[PDB]
Design an enzyme around this catalytic site. Structure first.
Site, PDB file in Angstrom:
ATOM      1  N   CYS A  32      24.739   8.987  11.672  1.00 40.97           N
ATOM      2  CA  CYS A  32      23.697   8.287  10.941  1.00 40.97           C
ATOM      3  C   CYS A  32      24.066   8.325   9.462  1.00 40.97           C
ATOM      4  O   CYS A  32      24.251   9.402   8.890  1.00 40.97           O
ATOM      5  CB  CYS A  32      22.337   8.930  11.212  1.00 40.97           C
ATOM      6  SG  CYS A  32      20.951   8.178  10.335  1.00 40.97           S
ATOM      7  N   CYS A  35      22.278  10.404   6.778  1.00 39.03           N
ATOM      8  CA  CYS A  35      22.486  11.825   7.025  1.00 39.03           C
ATOM      9  C   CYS A  35      23.802  12.325   6.444  1.00 39.03           C
ATOM     10  O   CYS A  35      23.854  13.414   5.876  1.00 39.03           O
ATOM     11  CB  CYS A  35      22.514  12.131   8.511  1.00 39.03           C
ATOM     12  SG  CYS A  35      20.906  11.884   9.273  1.00 39.03           S
TER      13      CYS A  35
END
Length: 105
Positions: A32, A35
């Site tokens: 992600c 992230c």
């Protein structure tokens, strides 16, 4: 060092080991983008906030923990004091992370 949590029991143990200290948990996934972006900043936080405990949950390694914590966006930062969740937000926002830590630490 940001402590990886891979089970419900390790999470409970970490909350107990923190005592009265603010615990901040980064719920993340390695795929992600946001992230990956915020990860170095999150690791850098122990230099700024020396009495806060930093945990990480990789939602792919620990789907049952993710489910129990009601995460829906990543990264999600959850804030715990004495074993209870006292705040949360999601998003790779450096400013909000610092301000939220400061509000609860």
């Amino acid at each position: 060092s940001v402590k990886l949590i891979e089970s419900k029991e390790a999470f409970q143990e970490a909350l107990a080991a923190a005592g009265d200290k603010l615990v901040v948990v980064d719920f993340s996934a390695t795929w992600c983008g946001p992230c990956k972006m915020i990860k170095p900043f999150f690791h850098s936080l122990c230099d700024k906030y020396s009495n806060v405990v930093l945990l990480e949950v990789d939602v792919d390694d620990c789907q049952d923990v993710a489910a129990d914590c009601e995460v829906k966006c990543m990264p999600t930062f959850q804030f715990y004091k004495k074993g209870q969740k006292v705040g949360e937000f999601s998003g790779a926002n450096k400013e909000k992370l610092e301000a939220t830590i400061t509000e609860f630490a």
